[PDB]
Design a protein around this nucleic acid. Sequence first.
RNA 1: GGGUGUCGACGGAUAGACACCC
RNA 2: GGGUGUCGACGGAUAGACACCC
Lengths: 59, 59
Amino acid sequence: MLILTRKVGESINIGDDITITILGVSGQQVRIGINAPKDVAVHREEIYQRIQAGLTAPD
Amino acid sequence: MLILTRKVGESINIGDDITITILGVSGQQVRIGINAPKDVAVHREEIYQRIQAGLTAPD
RNA sequence: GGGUGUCGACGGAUAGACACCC
RNA sequence: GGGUGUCGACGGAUAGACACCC
């Protein structure tokens, strides 16, 4: 676990091919943008488990 | 860019070896937790540019 | 046009949808 | 004990630090 703090409108990074941007917040919601090549996957934690379980939307 | 929305206390995922967690907010700050192996790097956008420019802090 | 909260979404979009207030 | 804003940090920690108000 590595915690960081970020004001809305700033950015964060992962690996050498991924970037993240805190687009903003509302109440307790947070718009979080991600920038990665389709060479890698990105999903919510409630969806990531499904890409690993047998799929339901291949195409 | 792939935007997502998350209430504080929930999570998101990247690749097959990284996880993210919206630990919370404060004013306009956002505590963001990250969980990845030391086999890969993770930093702020104001620090990532430095791991790509030069350093001496590593082992 | 602005503010606030909530929602929906394997969505790759600096994205949307709804309600309330000015 | 509670609320709010800000700060610091290549830090791998559900992490810290400060100020204001009750």
